[PDB]
mmCIF file of C-alpha atoms and ligand atoms in Angstrom:
data_model
loop_
_atom_site.group_PDB
_atom_site.id
_atom_site.type_symbol
_atom_site.label_atom_id
_atom_site.label_comp_id
_atom_site.label_asym_id
_atom_site.label_seq_id
_atom_site.Cartn_x
_atom_site.Cartn_y
_atom_site.Cartn_z
ATOM 1 C CA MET A 6 11.570 -17.218 4.233
ATOM 2 C CA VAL A 7 12.879 -16.439 7.695
ATOM 3 C CA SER A 8 15.707 -14.371 9.181
ATOM 4 C CA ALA A 9 16.690 -13.580 12.651
ATOM 5 C CA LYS A 10 14.890 -10.218 12.559
ATOM 6 C CA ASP A 11 12.889 -9.850 15.824
ATOM 7 C CA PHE A 12 9.708 -8.576 14.137
ATOM 8 C CA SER A 13 7.205 -9.643 11.559
ATOM 9 C CA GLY A 14 5.147 -7.476 9.243
ATOM 10 C CA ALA A 15 2.921 -7.913 6.145
ATOM 11 C CA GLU A 16 2.708 -7.417 2.457
ATOM 12 C CA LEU A 17 -0.578 -8.027 0.511
ATOM 13 C CA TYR A 18 -0.182 -8.050 -3.224
ATOM 14 C CA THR A 19 -2.391 -8.772 -6.221
ATOM 15 C CA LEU A 20 -1.276 -11.913 -8.151
ATOM 16 C CA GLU A 21 -2.000 -10.100 -11.531
ATOM 17 C CA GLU A 22 -0.624 -6.738 -12.725
ATOM 18 C CA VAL A 23 -2.321 -4.367 -15.113
ATOM 19 C CA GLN A 24 -1.714 -1.340 -17.205
ATOM 20 C CA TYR A 25 -3.560 1.828 -16.075
ATOM 21 C CA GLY A 26 -6.717 2.087 -13.860
ATOM 22 C CA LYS A 27 -8.199 3.437 -10.666
ATOM 23 C CA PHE A 28 -7.497 1.687 -7.415
ATOM 24 C CA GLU A 29 -9.318 2.384 -4.285
ATOM 25 C CA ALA A 30 -8.929 0.955 -0.777
ATOM 26 C CA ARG A 31 -10.977 1.808 2.348
ATOM 27 C CA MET A 32 -8.697 1.526 5.244
ATOM 28 C CA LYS A 33 -7.387 2.405 8.702
ATOM 29 C CA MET A 34 -3.694 2.582 8.872
ATOM 30 C CA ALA A 35 -1.119 1.691 11.528
ATOM 31 C CA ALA A 36 1.292 4.240 12.900
ATOM 32 C CA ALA A 37 4.041 4.374 15.504
ATOM 33 C CA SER A 38 7.402 6.120 15.324
ATOM 34 C CA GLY A 39 9.483 3.987 12.977
ATOM 35 C CA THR A 40 6.745 2.432 10.960
ATOM 36 C CA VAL A 41 5.545 2.426 7.315
ATOM 37 C CA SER A 42 1.855 1.543 6.441
ATOM 38 C CA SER A 43 1.021 1.738 2.810
ATOM 39 C CA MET A 44 -0.839 1.314 -0.460
ATOM 40 C CA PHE A 45 1.216 1.265 -3.638
ATOM 41 C CA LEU A 46 1.244 0.165 -7.362
ATOM 42 C CA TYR A 47 4.309 -1.828 -8.123
ATOM 43 C CA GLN A 48 5.829 -3.399 -11.221
ATOM 44 C CA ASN A 49 7.120 -6.714 -9.911
ATOM 45 C CA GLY A 50 10.874 -7.012 -10.648
ATOM 46 C CA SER A 51 11.702 -3.274 -10.366
ATOM 47 C CA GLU A 52 14.117 -4.272 -7.609
ATOM 48 C CA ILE A 53 16.217 -6.304 -10.166
ATOM 49 C CA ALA A 54 19.350 -4.324 -10.817
ATOM 50 C CA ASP A 55 19.958 -5.586 -14.363
ATOM 51 C CA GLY A 56 19.327 -2.327 -16.043
ATOM 52 C CA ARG A 57 15.549 -2.840 -15.954
ATOM 53 C CA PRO A 58 13.269 0.174 -15.374
ATOM 54 C CA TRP A 59 11.743 0.823 -11.864
ATOM 55 C CA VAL A 60 7.897 1.472 -11.904
ATOM 56 C CA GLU A 61 6.113 2.338 -8.629
ATOM 57 C CA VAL A 62 3.410 4.664 -7.274
ATOM 58 C CA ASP A 63 3.203 5.214 -3.455
ATOM 59 C CA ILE A 64 0.982 6.186 -0.595
ATOM 60 C CA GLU A 65 3.066 5.665 2.630
ATOM 61 C CA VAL A 66 1.960 6.721 6.208
ATOM 62 C CA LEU A 67 5.244 7.242 8.087
ATOM 63 C CA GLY A 68 4.619 6.338 11.706
ATOM 64 C CA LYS A 69 6.043 9.474 13.257
ATOM 65 C CA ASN A 70 3.320 11.580 11.575
ATOM 66 C CA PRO A 71 -0.024 9.717 11.454
ATOM 67 C CA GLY A 72 -1.805 13.021 10.449
ATOM 68 C CA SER A 73 -0.393 12.748 6.859
ATOM 69 C CA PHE A 74 1.035 10.597 4.193
ATOM 70 C CA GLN A 75 3.810 10.740 1.709
ATOM 71 C CA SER A 76 3.043 10.350 -1.987
ATOM 72 C CA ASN A 77 5.732 9.305 -4.410
ATOM 73 C CA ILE A 78 6.382 8.107 -8.035
ATOM 74 C CA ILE A 79 9.582 5.975 -8.330
ATOM 75 C CA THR A 80 10.972 5.634 -11.859
ATOM 76 C CA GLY A 81 14.539 5.447 -13.231
ATOM 77 C CA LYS A 82 16.209 2.019 -12.286
ATOM 78 C CA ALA A 83 17.637 0.278 -9.173
ATOM 79 C CA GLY A 84 20.596 2.245 -7.838
ATOM 80 C CA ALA A 85 19.495 5.224 -9.974
ATOM 81 C CA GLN A 86 15.984 5.983 -8.786
ATOM 82 C CA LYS A 87 14.072 9.179 -9.660
ATOM 83 C CA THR A 88 11.612 10.194 -6.925
ATOM 84 C CA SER A 89 9.148 12.901 -6.113
ATOM 85 C CA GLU A 90 8.221 12.753 -2.419
ATOM 86 C CA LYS A 91 5.388 15.002 -1.248
ATOM 87 C CA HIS A 92 3.321 15.144 1.910
ATOM 88 C CA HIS A 93 -0.404 15.350 2.409
ATOM 89 C CA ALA A 94 -2.556 15.930 5.440
ATOM 90 C CA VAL A 95 -5.156 13.423 6.447
ATOM 91 C CA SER A 96 -7.980 14.258 8.867
ATOM 92 C CA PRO A 97 -8.706 12.561 11.133
ATOM 93 C CA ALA A 98 -5.398 10.904 11.610
ATOM 94 C CA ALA A 99 -4.748 7.890 9.255
ATOM 95 C CA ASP A 100 -4.626 5.429 12.202
ATOM 96 C CA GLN A 101 -7.652 6.975 13.904
ATOM 97 C CA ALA A 102 -10.324 6.547 11.235
ATOM 98 C CA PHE A 103 -11.095 4.903 7.988
ATOM 99 C CA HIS A 104 -10.512 6.758 4.761
ATOM 100 C CA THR A 105 -10.779 5.861 1.121
ATOM 101 C CA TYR A 106 -7.418 6.099 -0.594
ATOM 102 C CA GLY A 107 -7.403 6.278 -4.351
ATOM 103 C CA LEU A 108 -4.679 5.960 -6.988
ATOM 104 C CA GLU A 109 -5.466 6.796 -10.670
ATOM 105 C CA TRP A 110 -2.983 5.866 -13.412
ATOM 106 C CA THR A 111 -3.279 6.788 -17.030
ATOM 107 C CA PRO A 112 -0.665 7.289 -19.733
ATOM 108 C CA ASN A 113 -0.751 11.031 -19.021
ATOM 109 C CA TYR A 114 -1.137 11.450 -15.236
ATOM 110 C CA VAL A 115 -1.191 9.798 -11.835
ATOM 111 C CA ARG A 116 -3.707 11.148 -9.253
ATOM 112 C CA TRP A 117 -3.950 10.554 -5.517
ATOM 113 C CA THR A 118 -7.300 11.015 -3.713
ATOM 114 C CA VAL A 119 -8.459 10.821 -0.024
ATOM 115 C CA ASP A 120 -12.193 10.294 0.426
ATOM 116 C CA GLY A 121 -12.751 11.276 -3.218
ATOM 117 C CA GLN A 122 -10.888 14.528 -2.956
ATOM 118 C CA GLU A 123 -7.689 15.091 -4.859
ATOM 119 C CA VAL A 124 -4.556 15.724 -2.877
ATOM 120 C CA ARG A 125 -2.039 15.370 -5.699
ATOM 121 C CA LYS A 126 -2.045 15.090 -9.524
ATOM 122 C CA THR A 127 1.100 14.653 -11.599
ATOM 123 C CA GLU A 128 0.998 15.105 -15.411
ATOM 124 C CA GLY A 129 3.756 13.886 -17.684
ATOM 125 C CA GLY A 130 7.345 13.851 -16.327
ATOM 126 C CA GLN A 131 7.725 10.620 -14.414
ATOM 127 C CA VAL A 132 4.269 9.477 -15.558
ATOM 128 C CA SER A 133 5.665 8.912 -18.977
ATOM 129 C CA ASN A 134 8.178 6.459 -17.502
ATOM 130 C CA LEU A 135 5.561 4.314 -15.731
ATOM 131 C CA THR A 136 5.700 1.715 -18.463
ATOM 132 C CA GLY A 137 4.427 -1.818 -18.391
ATOM 133 C CA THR A 138 2.110 -3.200 -15.846
ATOM 134 C CA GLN A 139 1.803 -2.797 -12.025
ATOM 135 C CA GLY A 140 0.258 -4.841 -9.318
ATOM 136 C CA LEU A 141 -1.665 -3.348 -6.275
ATOM 137 C CA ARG A 142 0.005 -3.841 -2.984
ATOM 138 C CA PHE A 143 -0.279 -2.882 0.681
ATOM 139 C CA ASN A 144 2.394 -3.393 3.326
ATOM 140 C CA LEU A 145 3.138 -2.700 6.923
ATOM 141 C CA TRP A 146 6.711 -2.679 8.241
ATOM 142 C CA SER A 147 9.352 -0.615 10.111
ATOM 143 C CA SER A 148 12.247 1.236 8.447
ATOM 144 C CA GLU A 149 15.709 1.515 9.986
ATOM 145 C CA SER A 150 15.961 5.008 8.730
ATOM 146 C CA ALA A 151 15.102 7.117 11.746
ATOM 147 C CA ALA A 152 15.325 10.306 9.669
ATOM 148 C CA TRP A 153 12.556 9.045 7.410
ATOM 149 C CA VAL A 154 10.212 7.346 9.833
ATOM 150 C CA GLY A 155 11.528 8.341 13.247
ATOM 151 C CA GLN A 156 13.076 6.220 15.976
ATOM 152 C CA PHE A 157 11.410 2.848 16.387
ATOM 153 C CA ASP A 158 8.884 2.892 19.178
ATOM 154 C CA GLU A 159 8.809 -0.864 19.862
ATOM 155 C CA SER A 160 6.627 -0.253 22.960
ATOM 156 C CA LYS A 161 3.669 0.680 20.788
ATOM 157 C CA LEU A 162 3.552 -2.956 19.044
ATOM 158 C CA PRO A 163 1.550 -4.694 18.154
ATOM 159 C CA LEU A 164 0.062 -2.588 15.458
ATOM 160 C CA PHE A 165 -2.644 -3.455 12.912
ATOM 161 C CA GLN A 166 -3.671 -1.924 9.504
ATOM 162 C CA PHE A 167 -7.319 -2.661 8.545
ATOM 163 C CA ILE A 168 -8.566 -2.967 5.003
ATOM 164 C CA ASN A 169 -12.378 -2.879 4.690
ATOM 165 C CA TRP A 170 -12.560 -3.146 0.985
ATOM 166 C CA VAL A 171 -10.665 -2.672 -2.286
ATOM 167 C CA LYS A 172 -12.065 -1.703 -5.675
ATOM 168 C CA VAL A 173 -10.157 -1.887 -8.989
ATOM 169 C CA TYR A 174 -11.327 -0.131 -12.127
ATOM 170 C CA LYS A 175 -10.149 -0.482 -15.705
ATOM 171 C CA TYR A 176 -8.929 2.597 -17.557
ATOM 172 C CA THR A 177 -11.889 3.182 -19.953
ATOM 173 C CA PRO A 178 -11.075 6.676 -21.412
ATOM 174 C CA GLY A 179 -14.215 8.154 -22.952
ATOM 175 C CA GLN A 180 -15.877 4.816 -22.451
ATOM 176 C CA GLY A 181 -15.886 5.026 -18.560
ATOM 177 C CA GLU A 182 -18.813 4.943 -16.309
ATOM 178 C CA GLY A 183 -21.034 7.850 -15.340
ATOM 179 C CA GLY A 184 -18.984 10.025 -17.714
ATOM 180 C CA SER A 185 -15.731 9.177 -15.825
ATOM 181 C CA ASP A 186 -12.833 7.440 -17.485
ATOM 182 C CA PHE A 187 -12.887 4.291 -15.309
ATOM 183 C CA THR A 188 -15.071 1.179 -15.325
ATOM 184 C CA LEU A 189 -15.303 -0.876 -12.164
ATOM 185 C CA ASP A 190 -13.810 -4.157 -12.756
ATOM 186 C CA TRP A 191 -13.706 -6.000 -9.366
ATOM 187 C CA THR A 192 -14.211 -5.542 -5.612
ATOM 188 C CA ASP A 193 -13.073 -7.460 -2.562
ATOM 189 C CA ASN A 194 -14.933 -6.883 0.662
ATOM 190 C CA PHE A 195 -12.476 -9.080 2.573
ATOM 191 C CA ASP A 196 -15.013 -11.387 4.205
ATOM 192 C CA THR A 197 -12.304 -13.870 3.543
ATOM 193 C CA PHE A 198 -8.684 -13.952 2.247
ATOM 194 C CA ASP A 199 -9.021 -14.764 -1.387
ATOM 195 C CA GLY A 200 -5.896 -16.639 -2.483
ATOM 196 C CA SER A 201 -7.072 -16.663 -6.143
ATOM 197 C CA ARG A 202 -6.607 -12.909 -6.098
ATOM 198 C CA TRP A 203 -3.961 -12.078 -3.533
ATOM 199 C CA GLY A 204 -0.595 -13.181 -2.362
ATOM 200 C CA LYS A 205 1.172 -12.771 0.940
ATOM 201 C CA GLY A 206 4.720 -11.490 1.183
ATOM 202 C CA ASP A 207 7.281 -13.900 2.573
ATOM 203 C CA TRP A 208 10.559 -12.110 2.401
ATOM 204 C CA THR A 209 12.477 -9.068 3.824
ATOM 205 C CA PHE A 210 14.818 -6.452 2.461
ATOM 206 C CA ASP A 211 17.715 -4.251 3.694
ATOM 207 C CA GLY A 212 16.593 -1.417 5.872
ATOM 208 C CA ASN A 213 13.459 -3.326 6.867
ATOM 209 C CA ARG A 214 13.770 -4.529 10.536
ATOM 210 C CA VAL A 215 10.919 -7.060 10.066
ATOM 211 C CA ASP A 216 10.353 -10.124 8.165
ATOM 212 C CA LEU A 217 7.192 -10.002 5.931
ATOM 213 C CA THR A 218 5.292 -13.206 6.653
ATOM 214 C CA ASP A 219 2.173 -15.022 5.781
ATOM 215 C CA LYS A 220 1.202 -15.222 9.411
ATOM 216 C CA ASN A 221 0.712 -11.387 9.494
ATOM 217 C CA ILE A 222 -2.296 -11.265 7.140
ATOM 218 C CA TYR A 223 -5.708 -12.617 7.958
ATOM 219 C CA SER A 224 -9.424 -11.645 7.770
ATOM 220 C CA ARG A 225 -12.074 -11.284 10.489
ATOM 221 C CA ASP A 226 -15.408 -9.541 10.562
ATOM 222 C CA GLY A 227 -15.148 -8.186 6.967
ATOM 223 C CA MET A 228 -11.746 -6.773 7.480
ATOM 224 C CA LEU A 229 -8.400 -7.820 6.094
ATOM 225 C CA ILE A 230 -5.878 -7.306 8.913
ATOM 226 C CA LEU A 231 -2.149 -6.631 8.300
ATOM 227 C CA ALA A 232 -0.131 -7.098 11.574
ATOM 228 C CA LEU A 233 3.212 -5.608 12.711
ATOM 229 C CA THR A 234 4.320 -7.680 15.807
ATOM 230 C CA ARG A 235 7.174 -9.237 17.670
ATOM 231 C CA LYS A 236 7.990 -12.660 16.095
ATOM 232 C CA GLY A 237 5.657 -15.366 17.328
ATOM 233 C CA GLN A 238 2.963 -12.866 18.410
ATOM 234 C CA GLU A 239 1.239 -12.409 15.097
ATOM 235 C CA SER A 240 -2.294 -13.203 16.235
ATOM 236 C CA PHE A 241 -4.828 -10.461 16.709
ATOM 237 C CA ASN A 242 -6.496 -10.537 20.096
ATOM 238 C CA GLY A 243 -8.680 -7.392 20.014
ATOM 239 C CA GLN A 244 -12.031 -6.349 18.571
ATOM 240 C CA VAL A 245 -12.088 -5.439 14.914
ATOM 241 C CA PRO A 246 -13.017 -1.775 14.367
ATOM 242 C CA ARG A 247 -16.267 -0.839 12.641
ATOM 243 C CA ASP A 248 -16.402 1.366 9.613
HETATM 244 CA CA1 CA B 11 -15.351 -5.341 4.410
#
């Protein structure tokens, strides 16, 4: 899908969705005023305004402040969303080093972790409204809401978000591993783009100044790269960072 938008971004998403689990991703985020660099659980179809419930859990690095990320739980329905934005410091800055971002989802709570340390845990409330299944996604784009992400600093493009690896665990309460309540299910070390596991976004949405396209996701040197660039300049010409 293609529009006249001058920029292209990326959205990586799992082809399958699941109910509950732990999701970890080792990554280095991208950040410039005006950008959004993320990791989120998402129930496909939530955007359908037919009275259907919205189910989503977010980790979003807003480009204007690379030293922190916003957490969020989105429930309710399209046009009538219920949110819970919170902010958490990340050191060193999200775009300066790799960190391990974790999301835990059970029937009773959602937990956010950075390098194994909890930064947020929500129990009940919106967690009870996270029904159904959710897929694991990551995207990199730029919001037209200057108040949320800051004025768009186009001069800083191109930008790249690097994903070293992803681990997904099944929710095994009381049956988990090492005493925990999660059992490792699968891991992707991104030595390749595995199309049997992931999809690449190929759409855009209002408020996004970029087209999400398949040309903005690729792998090199054990890293999955998400690119935010001007249209036609999606290729990465640098050296992949080491973790
Ligand atoms: Ca890797």
